[PDB]
Amino acid sequence: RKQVSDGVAHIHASFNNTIVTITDRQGNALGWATAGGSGFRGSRKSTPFAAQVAAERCADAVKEYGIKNLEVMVKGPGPGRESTIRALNAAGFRITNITDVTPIPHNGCRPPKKRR
Amino acid sequence: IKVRENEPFDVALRRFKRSCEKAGVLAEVRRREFYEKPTTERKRAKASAVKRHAKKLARENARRT
Amino acid sequence: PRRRVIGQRKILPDPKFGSELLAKFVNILMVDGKKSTAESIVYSALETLAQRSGKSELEAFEVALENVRPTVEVKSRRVGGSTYQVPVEVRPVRRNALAMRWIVEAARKRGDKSMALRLANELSDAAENKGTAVKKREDVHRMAEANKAFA
RNA sequence: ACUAUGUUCACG
RNA sequence: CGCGGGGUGGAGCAGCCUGGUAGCUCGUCGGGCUCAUAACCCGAAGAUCGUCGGUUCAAAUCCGGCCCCCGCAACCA
RNA sequence: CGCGGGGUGGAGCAGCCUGGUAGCUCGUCGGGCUCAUAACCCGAAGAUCGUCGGUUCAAAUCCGGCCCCCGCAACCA
RNA sequence: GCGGCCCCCUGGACGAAGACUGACGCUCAGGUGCGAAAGCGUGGGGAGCAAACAGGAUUAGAUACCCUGGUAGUCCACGCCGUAAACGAUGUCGACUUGGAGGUUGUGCCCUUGAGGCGUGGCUUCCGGAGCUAACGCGUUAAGUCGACCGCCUGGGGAGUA
RNA sequence: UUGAGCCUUGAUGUGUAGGAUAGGUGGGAGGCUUUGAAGUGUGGACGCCAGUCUGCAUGGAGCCGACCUUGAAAUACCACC
Ligand SMILES: [Mg+2]
Ligand SMILES: [Mg+2]
Ligand SMILES: [Mg+2]
Ligand SMILES: [Mg+2]
Ligand SMILES: [Mg+2]
Ligand SMILES: [Mg+2]
Ligand SMILES: [Mg+2]
Ligand SMILES: [Mg+2]
Ligand SMILES: [Mg+2]
Ligand SMILES: [Mg+2]
Ligand SMILES: [Mg+2]
Ligand SMILES: [Mg+2]
Ligand SMILES: [Mg+2]
Ligand SMILES: [Mg+2]
Ligand SMILES: [Mg+2]
Ligand SMILES: [Mg+2]
Ligand SMILES: [Mg+2]
Ligand SMILES: [Mg+2]
Ligand SMILES: [Mg+2]
Ligand SMILES: [Mg+2]
Ligand SMILES: [Mg+2]
Ligand SMILES: [Mg+2]
Ligand SMILES: [Mg+2]
Ligand SMILES: [Mg+2]
Ligand SMILES: [Mg+2]
Ligand SMILES: [Mg+2]
Ligand SMILES: [Mg+2]
Ligand SMILES: [Mg+2]
Ligand SMILES: [Mg+2]
Ligand SMILES: [Mg+2]
Ligand SMILES: [Mg+2]
Ligand SMILES: [Mg+2]
Ligand SMILES: [Mg+2]
Ligand SMILES: [Mg+2]
Ligand SMILES: [Mg+2]
Ligand SMILES: [Mg+2]
Ligand SMILES: [Mg+2]
Ligand SMILES: [Mg+2]
Ligand SMILES: [Mg+2]
Ligand SMILES: [Mg+2]
Ligand SMILES: [Mg+2]
Ligand SMILES: [Mg+2]
Ligand SMILES: [Mg+2]
Ligand SMILES: [Mg+2]
Ligand SMILES: [Mg+2]
Ligand SMILES: [Mg+2]
Ligand SMILES: [Mg+2]
Ligand SMILES: [Mg+2]
Ligand SMILES: [Mg+2]
Ligand SMILES: [Mg+2]
Ligand SMILES: [Mg+2]
Ligand SMILES: [Mg+2]
Ligand SMILES: [Mg+2]
Ligand SMILES: [Mg+2]
Ligand SMILES: [Mg+2]
Ligand SMILES: [Mg+2]
Ligand SMILES: [Mg+2]
Ligand SMILES: [Mg+2]
Ligand SMILES: [Mg+2]
Ligand SMILES: [Mg+2]
Ligand SMILES: [Mg+2]
Ligand SMILES: [Mg+2]
Ligand SMILES: [Mg+2]
Ligand SMILES: [Mg+2]
Ligand SMILES: [Mg+2]
Ligand SMILES: [Mg+2]
Ligand SMILES: [Mg+2]
Ligand SMILES: [Mg+2]
Ligand SMILES: [Mg+2]
Ligand SMILES: [Mg+2]
Ligand SMILES: [Mg+2]
Ligand SMILES: [Mg+2]
Ligand SMILES: [Mg+2]
Ligand SMILES: [Mg+2]
Ligand SMILES: [Mg+2]
Ligand SMILES: [Mg+2]
Ligand SMILES: [Mg+2]
Ligand SMILES: [Mg+2]
Ligand SMILES: [Mg+2]
């Protein structure tokens, strides 16, 4: 059933969370995991370790598809990502390449109001 | 940004990102930088720069160290 | 001490079992400076332990103390502002000393009959890990394991 | 994280 | 009027059609935590199936009632 | 005068129309914390239920009178 | 006050060496013109943001701060408003009086004999001399030294109110 | 297309005893094998990962039913589910 050779691991690393989602070549999502879904709720959800465990939980539950190697597409800033990529090697993948899709507006929409 | 690092290496080493953007997208266009405040906070970052650079010329004091 | 890095005092070996490990155990068990009463109890406990276990005294005390020994314990530092659970690898001097407290602290409770009986039964349960002292280490691990997110 | 107030005139 | 489903720790749920091992979330007390409070985390205290009856190696489980159980379309004395 | 509804610690509310052991949120009182007061934490006391009566084995709760309080009616010519 | 890139029309600024005009100048009460943002009117437009407003926390209370929503507004065309800590808190014009370090834009002279140098003009940031100042500081872009004219001030509250 | 009903055919179905990833029941003791065998190279189907199932062949014609463990006996043949 399907049995895809290669894939792409999008990592939406926000301040409060790290959503890991593994997809195919044409951006067809095969499985995912999050920091909140791993357990780790509240203060713990925003840490480098709670991202690592999510990428480990995303590494399994995509074994039916049987991905050998994948690319990485990190997004947002976050405490994760410089930690989440370590987890994908340790789990059992080969990183072909690492990229960003961090949305940089060329002074577009007005950002939200500054807080105090 | 697009960093492959050949094949035997892995260990991240993506200073290409950290020394290019990140701060530009994040701690600047995250919340509202009120037009005037940059003109203030730059000119004080700029005044603090020449304060140090002018002092660095006169930093050679007696010391006795 | 704020910047006063000084070492610790030397201790003494126990006449009948001349060593160090159980010499400290006598001291933690001791109430009201009565080392005469305390040291008699530890000999009475380890002799009753060695009879049942079928081992010596030092190795009987060791295969017991290691089963109640903490690998990691939990501190909590406020670096930045907030207060959260930071586990840390315990130092080797405190490691076995913190275990000896948990054996004695458990033996205060569990009112069998004598102190020599209670320590013997606690160390006997520690050998087959099913006492109160092992449960106190078990809970200490569960904090470090659950709160591993914080370095 | 939040965290209020200190009756009147004087003594120097 | 019915034919039908539905019935458990205090409670919401499943599990009940293919008999051998009743889970799961809030009420539960002790911790660890910190100069402390909140949180967060760890483990504990409670139903042998609403209840009674047949068979068969083993029955919340298969089958009949109840209290009853809600759904219904039909009920125009 | 007519028909609903009330009257419960110091305050405002449950418990009252199905008679058996009266809660909640405040305040008062005792102790903490603080330089002190507040806030906050910890205990504690405080109502025989409008009253006079009946029913009962027993009435805050049922029934009747009286005493206040509150709403609605008090209309056609 | 004005920032993607391109054309259309368009105001000024500065330099180079001449030629021309021949005091045509400087200030300016009344007066006129422009004048951020928020407002206001009318017609559009409306992603994001976001007064008001709603809900959730916080709290003794929370008409706030924090969180989730979210309308006028914010955008364009045409008018009105005529104010701001509209600030170098420093009126406009001119002359004169030691420096240093930069930036920025010119223009001339030698070798461009190699990202050179050596000069003379504009605008401009910083540090300092004499001098000035209550002091802080200013300091050739004066708050120094003088001249022209204008505006304004005369204790604090009442009040930039009636 | 992808569902449901439905026949052919083929597996599938590990409380515990235990050589068995055995549901209940049964015609009743030779099937099968040279209608080219046991063991295995390797890979597939299945998998509660205990160990089933099988393409083809180097190999070469054997393998084995009651017996002993069960509430039950062997998909050795075969009937019905
Ligand atoms: Mg936000
Ligand atoms: Mg500005
Ligand atoms: Mg006051
Ligand atoms: Mg009828
Ligand atoms: Mg009252
Ligand atoms: Mg009562
Ligand atoms: Mg109170
Ligand atoms: Mg009481
Ligand atoms: Mg009284
Ligand atoms: Mg009666
Ligand atoms: Mg009666
Ligand atoms: Mg009563
Ligand atoms: Mg009652
Ligand atoms: Mg530009
Ligand atoms: Mg444009
Ligand atoms: Mg032009
Ligand atoms: Mg010009
Ligand atoms: Mg001339
Ligand atoms: Mg002439
Ligand atoms: Mg002439
Ligand atoms: Mg005037
Ligand atoms: Mg005028
Ligand atoms: Mg105008
Ligand atoms: Mg405007
Ligand atoms: Mg408008
Ligand atoms: Mg109007
Ligand atoms: Mg109009
Ligand atoms: Mg419109
Ligand atoms: Mg409009
Ligand atoms: Mg509109
Ligand atoms: Mg809108
Ligand atoms: Mg519209
Ligand atoms: Mg919003
Ligand atoms: Mg808001
Ligand atoms: Mg409004
Ligand atoms: Mg509101
Ligand atoms: Mg407060
Ligand atoms: Mg209150
Ligand atoms: Mg509130
Ligand atoms: Mg409000
Ligand atoms: Mg509000
Ligand atoms: Mg209006
Ligand atoms: Mg436009
Ligand atoms: Mg406009
Ligand atoms: Mg006008
Ligand atoms: Mg003004
Ligand atoms: Mg301005
Ligand atoms: Mg300015
Ligand atoms: Mg200026
Ligand atoms: Mg002014
Ligand atoms: Mg001016
Ligand atoms: Mg002028
Ligand atoms: Mg003028
Ligand atoms: Mg001048
Ligand atoms: Mg000079
Ligand atoms: Mg100079
Ligand atoms: Mg220069
Ligand atoms: Mg210059
Ligand atoms: Mg030069
Ligand atoms: Mg110049
Ligand atoms: Mg300057
Ligand atoms: Mg000046
Ligand atoms: Mg200056
Ligand atoms: Mg200066
Ligand atoms: Mg000059
Ligand atoms: Mg000079
Ligand atoms: Mg100058
Ligand atoms: Mg000059
Ligand atoms: Mg000059
Ligand atoms: Mg000048
Ligand atoms: Mg100059
Ligand atoms: Mg002057
Ligand atoms: Mg002056
Ligand atoms: Mg005047
Ligand atoms: Mg005047
Ligand atoms: Mg006056
Ligand atoms: Mg005036
Ligand atoms: Mg005004
Ligand atoms: Mg006025």
mmCIF file of C-alpha atoms in Angstrom, chain A residues 48-93:
data_model
loop_
_atom_site.group_PDB
_atom_site.id
_atom_site.type_symbol
_atom_site.label_atom_id
_atom_site.label_comp_id
_atom_site.label_asym_id
_atom_site.label_seq_id
_atom_site.Cartn_x
_atom_site.Cartn_y
_atom_site.Cartn_z
ATOM 1 C CA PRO A 48 13.671 21.757 23.366
ATOM 2 C CA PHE A 49 13.011 18.293 24.902
ATOM 3 C CA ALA A 50 9.210 18.407 24.401
ATOM 4 C CA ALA A 51 9.983 19.066 20.708
ATOM 5 C CA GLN A 52 12.451 16.135 20.594
ATOM 6 C CA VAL A 53 9.849 13.695 21.989
ATOM 7 C CA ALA A 54 7.263 14.950 19.442
ATOM 8 C CA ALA A 55 9.647 14.283 16.515
ATOM 9 C CA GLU A 56 10.298 10.823 18.019
ATOM 10 C CA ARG A 57 6.498 10.321 18.164
ATOM 11 C CA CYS A 58 6.301 11.575 14.536
ATOM 12 C CA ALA A 59 9.176 9.246 13.500
ATOM 13 C CA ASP A 60 6.991 6.252 14.383
ATOM 14 C CA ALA A 61 3.386 6.194 13.083
ATOM 15 C CA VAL A 62 4.840 6.707 9.560
ATOM 16 C CA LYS A 63 6.341 3.175 9.320
ATOM 17 C CA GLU A 64 3.529 1.810 7.106
ATOM 18 C CA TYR A 65 4.754 4.325 4.501
ATOM 19 C CA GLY A 66 8.385 3.285 5.110
ATOM 20 C CA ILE A 67 10.327 6.497 4.495
ATOM 21 C CA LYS A 68 14.113 5.976 4.252
ATOM 22 C CA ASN A 69 15.210 9.619 3.874
ATOM 23 C CA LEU A 70 13.584 13.060 4.173
ATOM 24 C CA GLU A 71 14.111 16.824 3.903
ATOM 25 C CA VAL A 72 13.461 19.250 6.771
ATOM 26 C CA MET A 73 11.371 22.438 6.448
ATOM 27 C CA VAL A 74 11.445 24.249 9.817
ATOM 28 C CA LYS A 75 8.995 27.136 10.381
ATOM 29 C CA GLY A 76 8.642 29.858 13.040
ATOM 30 C CA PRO A 77 11.286 30.637 15.710
ATOM 31 C CA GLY A 78 10.606 28.595 18.902
ATOM 32 C CA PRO A 79 12.775 26.757 21.454
ATOM 33 C CA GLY A 80 12.666 23.655 19.205
ATOM 34 C CA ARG A 81 14.239 23.024 15.754
ATOM 35 C CA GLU A 82 17.866 23.280 17.038
ATOM 36 C CA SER A 83 17.014 20.032 18.873
ATOM 37 C CA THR A 84 14.155 18.614 16.752
ATOM 38 C CA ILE A 85 16.563 17.876 13.848
ATOM 39 C CA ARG A 86 18.787 15.918 16.300
ATOM 40 C CA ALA A 87 15.731 13.724 17.059
ATOM 41 C CA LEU A 88 15.139 12.768 13.388
ATOM 42 C CA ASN A 89 18.687 11.327 13.098
ATOM 43 C CA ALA A 90 18.497 9.503 16.446
ATOM 44 C CA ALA A 91 15.089 8.040 15.492
ATOM 45 C CA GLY A 92 16.200 6.604 12.126
ATOM 46 C CA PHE A 93 16.240 8.839 9.040
#
